[PDB]
Amino acid sequence: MDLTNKNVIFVAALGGIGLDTSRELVKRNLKNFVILDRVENPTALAELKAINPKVNITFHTYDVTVPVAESKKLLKKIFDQLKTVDILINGAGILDDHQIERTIAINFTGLVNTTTAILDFWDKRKGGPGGIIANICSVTGFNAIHQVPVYSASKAAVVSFTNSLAKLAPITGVTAYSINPGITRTPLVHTFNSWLDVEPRVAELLLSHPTQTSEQCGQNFVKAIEANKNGAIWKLDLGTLEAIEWTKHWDSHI
Amino acid sequence: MDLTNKNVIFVAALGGIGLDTSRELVKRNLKNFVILDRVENPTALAELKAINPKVNITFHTYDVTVPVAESKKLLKKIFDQLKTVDILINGAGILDDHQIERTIAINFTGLVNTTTAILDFWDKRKGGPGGIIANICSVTGFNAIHQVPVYSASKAAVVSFTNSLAKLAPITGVTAYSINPGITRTPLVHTFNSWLDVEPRVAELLLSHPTQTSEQCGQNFVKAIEANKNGAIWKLDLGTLEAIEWTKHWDSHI
Ligand SMILES: NC(=O)c1ccc[n+]([C@@H]2O[C@H](COP(=O)([O-])OP(=O)(O)OC[C@H]3O[C@@H](n4cnc5c(N)ncnc54)[C@H](O)[C@@H]3O)[C@@H](O)[C@H]2O)c1
């Protein structure tokens, strides 16, 4: 996949991992880079506009906890403007296991709802052109940080969901793969709440082991996009990029 | 784990898999068998009472979509009466990928919230005795039925969540294992909605392959309880019982 003159929507482009991924994407000579995020970051937006003024960067306010109808409304307006959208990147995430419902709504439900909304425009069954979805999950969706079990469970949900999207590609025309960063030095993991405070020092303990920077993660993120492998499960851990194999513990046979 | 004179709470005991598991549990000479389910099934309750009248069977109305505080209120009352609860079984589940939010709230969030509620009474850190949690998940949490990707992703979440609980047992005193039925002939899978109707015949196609009855599933369910393995991931597929090994794709090192 050649990103030149592509139309990309990035949900939550202006967060730690997002911003660094966004800096790399804008170097690729996108036609349109649409940022959907809950909160404006004018600094980050100004930066990204500086990096490559050939790219048309647009920002819409977007909370992923809104209902599908709301997402549909917003996507209609984007599709109306741009006509075609090549790539959707779902990047919204909260780490805070004192916030059980909000964790799940943002990390899992919200990702599912944006995806369901964009399938209205993409589904080949309704005559749509198909599309590519890049889901930011997490290595914690493979194997939990069990001191943040809710966070990890929500990421396990999106890894599964993403795997199922990729299997639906022949019906929907929409391919999908997950991007799963290992521990990355962003503000998200700087400090955070463990579930029932089983481990109040969970951030300090995590950053006592090998981490990666946002930038190395950013770089590998765009490489995974350009590889464009339907069904890939990308691990971006410790500055590297690798596709993991999902264990087949059971098969539905359909 | 000898079930004799134990106090068991079973969330959603009166459903297809539930009822058949409940029939086997009441044969074990429980002191107290507390059924929490959204809806009364008097027929099922009468049956269960008939099977072993030595067991004290109690029914409380319980929707798992209520807030933790609500679950805490209800559990307080139960713990008040019984004093001690040995085992909590979380069995609520809906299969219906036209109901995205409800699927996630019931299958994932609700499980997480009941668990979080009961830890108030169990957590050894608050001087509680600890406790045992049996989570009914699903083989779809290992490997999706991708025509019901939301359902599968919700079950992947609770598999993960349950694995993490088991790792937290040294801190909380609460051990936990999942029970993961293969396709079982209950009403749940008789007919159901695929996500975006990618496959309207998903039930008919699933029941064209080897299934198991509720009864064989029920029997194996109680065996897994009696094995009482913290951390176990029980597959109950095709009339059998086996613990699967979770792939270590990534380690947090904490
Ligand atoms: N940092 C890590 O170690 C790490 C590891 C694995 C996976 N992840 C995942 O990577 C992504 C970003 O993580 P990060 O380090 O950049 O965290 P971060 O705190 O820097 O920001 C994550 C992004 O989520 C967005 N967001 C949060 N709630 C939202 C909502 N309701 N609607 C829209 N956007 C919302 C924020 O605006 C931000 O842009 C998330 O999906 C996250 O869970 C992070």
Ligand SMILES: NC(=O)c1ccc[n+]([C@@H]2O[C@H](COP(=O)([O-])OP(=O)(O)OC[C@H]3O[C@@H](n4cnc5c(N)ncnc54)[C@H](O)[C@@H]3O)[C@@H](O)[C@H]2O)c1
């Ligand atoms: N039948 C299968 O093939 C199968 C396979 C694997 C896992 N499971 C899981 O087993 C559990 C029950 O499955 P089943 O086949 O017996 O389904 P079922 O339709 O017969 O009933 C499931 C139970 O969930 C309860 N429930 C639903 N919403 C609830 C809510 N809001 N609050 C409280 N309880 C609620 C129902 O009342 C019922 O007791 C679920 O976790 C389900 O997903 C089923």
